């Protein structure tokens, strides 16, 4: 029962009990004890799932605050808007730290120490995810340089995915799904989004490792495509 086996196990207790912030701290201590050695497949997923649930709740709250704000601004009730603007500012500064916490961990050790192609596309995609989450709320010059880092990290992940990983590889299908989503809402290009996610979907159908894991993304890819292609408006 080493200290590394202690924190990997204690992360599953915070994961099972929805104590995700502490689950991040446990996996953070797992990473900040390694030189040029990378995390195992489970430890890799653990940390990423831990940060996923954390940033997911913060994002949900931000979308809700932005929506209520844009209604009060649509009404013109200014004394309420100034309060929602201040409240959203607090949420956005947390998101800065949450993305800073993983990006400065991806940039420091996870990406350089990635040896296999599976870990390269993994940690590269992760960078794009949290840089894309910054582009959701950041405005002005920060948004431009955020989507720059989102597009740059997603592209390098695609080079490694298209030459080393198989089309049905989860790490590759998930990369392409996030890639298409980045095109649709952040760059507002449906054809750049659809052509990337149609290309990646059909190469998984043509080629077809248990695919229950992959087909979960294949159902989320086709769902995205189909609803986009529909002429109706969100």
């Amino acid at each position: 029962p080493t200290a590394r086996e202690e924190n990997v196990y204690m992360a599953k207790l915070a994961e099972q009990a929805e104590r995700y912030e502490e689950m991040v701290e446990f996996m953070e201590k797992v990473s900040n004890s390694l030189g040029s050695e990378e995390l195992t497949v489970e430890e890799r997923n653990l940390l990423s799932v831990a940060y996923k649930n954390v940033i997911g709740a913060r994002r949900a709250s931000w979308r809700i605050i932005s929506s209520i704000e844009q209604k009060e601004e649509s009404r013109g009730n200014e004394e309420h808007v100034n309060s929602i603007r201040e409240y959203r500012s607090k949420i956005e500064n947390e998101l800065s730290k949450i993305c800073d916490g993983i990006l400065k961990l991806l940039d420091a050790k996870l990406i350089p120490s990635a040896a296999s192609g599976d870990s390269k596309v993994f940690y590269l995609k992760m960078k794009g995810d949290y840089h894309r989450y910054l582009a959701e709320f950041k405005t002005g010059a920060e948004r431009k340089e955020a989507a720059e880092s989102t597009l740059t990290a997603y592209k390098a992940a695609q080079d490694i995915a298209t030459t080393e990983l198989a089309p049905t590889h989860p790490i590759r299908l998930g990369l392409a799904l996030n890639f298409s989503v980045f095109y649709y809402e952040i760059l507002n290009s449906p054809d750049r989004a659809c052509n990337l996610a149609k290309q990646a979907f059909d190469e998984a159908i043509a080629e077809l490792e248990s695919y229950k894991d992959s087909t979960l993304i294949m159902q989320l890819l086709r769902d995205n495509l189909t609803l986009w292609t529909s002429d109706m408006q969100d």
Binding site: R63, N178, V181, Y184, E185, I217, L220, L221, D223, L227
Partner: peptide
Amino acid sequence: YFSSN
């Protein structure tokens, strides 16, 4: 808020 992973 389209599907993502």
